[PDB]
């Protein structure tokens, strides 16, 4: 992962790009009640 997607100073649309940071895993129990009910 780099900062500028192109050799140009174009920043790119925010929120669009590769992200590697650790994040909580999404899990929804189907309606022990461990997690919230699943949704489409």
């Amino acid at each position: 992962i780099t900062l500028f997607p192109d050799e140009n100073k174009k920043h790119g649309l925010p929120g669009i790009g590769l992200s590697t940071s650790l994040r909580p895993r999404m899990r929804f129990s189907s309606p022990c009640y461990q997690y919230s009910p699943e949704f489409p």
Binding site: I1, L3, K9, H11, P14, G15, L18, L22, P24
Partner: protein, 281 residues
């Protein structure tokens, strides 16, 4: 054209929060790029410094200059070594032996400044000043969010200086352990908000037990403090025993568990002891 429409105060507040989220994601991407370049640069610097220290050691004659280099490389603690290797911020200010890495780091700093404020920020600032000039705003919370967002657009360096202390790099081997640790920490933080009861204390005890059993706690005290749930455990402590200070102390088992967790956290590392000293009073 959603920004350009004549929005009411709640709607414009929600889109201020949306723009704040966009700024946060952009800062996160910046930190990711910084981490990547930091990895590459520190690899180059480490190998070069070890090679040059070996070369200095190969000198047949040992003198005052030789012992100066010995203190330069070996005696100084690693943080002092990093600060020494990064002292070349000014132009030719007692720079280390390499200079190609100096050029590379200067180029990276320049492009990082370019990516920072030094076209989303201009748009956000223009919309904010336009809305402020449109009419008098009655919501203090809306005004506060407006001005904090405007300030964060005008100062992108503040995000860096407030986020780099909290950033950390973990090895790819312990990714699952880090994820489990973060999940347990999230559970503890979530249970902090709700009212206290027996089921709550059982869940906190189970979470703390998982925290002890996790090997990341032993390996990375620096990350442990950076996440900083010693503060959250102290918050749980004060919540439990605020009434008990006056009278009728509750949850003796959980206060004992919190004491054990804090003692173990202090014992793992020296700097953790200093971090916990502030709550001595």
């Amino acid at each position: 054209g959603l920004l350009q429409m004549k929005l009411p105060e709640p709607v414009k507040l929600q889109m201020c929060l949306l723009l704040q989220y966009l700024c946060d994601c952009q800062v996160r991407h910046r930190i990711e790029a910084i981490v990547a370049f930091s990895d590459d640069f520190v690899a180059k610097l480490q190998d070069n410094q070890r090679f040059r220290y070996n070369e200095v050691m190969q000198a047949l004659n040992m003198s005052a200059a030789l012992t100066a280099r010995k203190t330069r490389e070996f005696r100084s603690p690693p943080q002092e070594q990093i600060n020494m290797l990064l002292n070349f911020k000014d132009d030719k200010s007692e720079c280390p032996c390499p200079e190609e890495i100096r050029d590379q780091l200067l180029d990276f700093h320049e492009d990082l400044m370019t990516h920072c404020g030094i076209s989303l920020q201009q748009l956000i600032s223009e919309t904010m000043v336009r809305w402020a000039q449109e009419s008098v705003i009655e919501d203090p919370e809306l005004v506060r969010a407006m001005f904090v967002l405007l300030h964060r657009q005008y100062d992108g360096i503040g995000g860096l200086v407030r986020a780099l202390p909290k950033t950390y790099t973990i090895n790819g081997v312990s990714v699952e352990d880090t994820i489990n640790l973060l999940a347990s920490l999230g559970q503890i933080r979530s249970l902090l908000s709700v009212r206290m009861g027996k089921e709550e204390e059982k869940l906190m005890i189970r979470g703390l037990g998982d925290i002890m059993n996790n090997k990341v706690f032993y390996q990375h005290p620096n990350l442990m403090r950076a996440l900083g749930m010693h503060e959250t455990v102290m918050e749980v402590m004060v919540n439990v025993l605020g009434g008990g200070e006056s009278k009728e102390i509750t949850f003796p088992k959980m206060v004992a568990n919190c004491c054990r967790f804090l003692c173990y956290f202090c014992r793992i590392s020296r700097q953790n002891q200093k971090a916990m000293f502030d709550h001595l009073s």
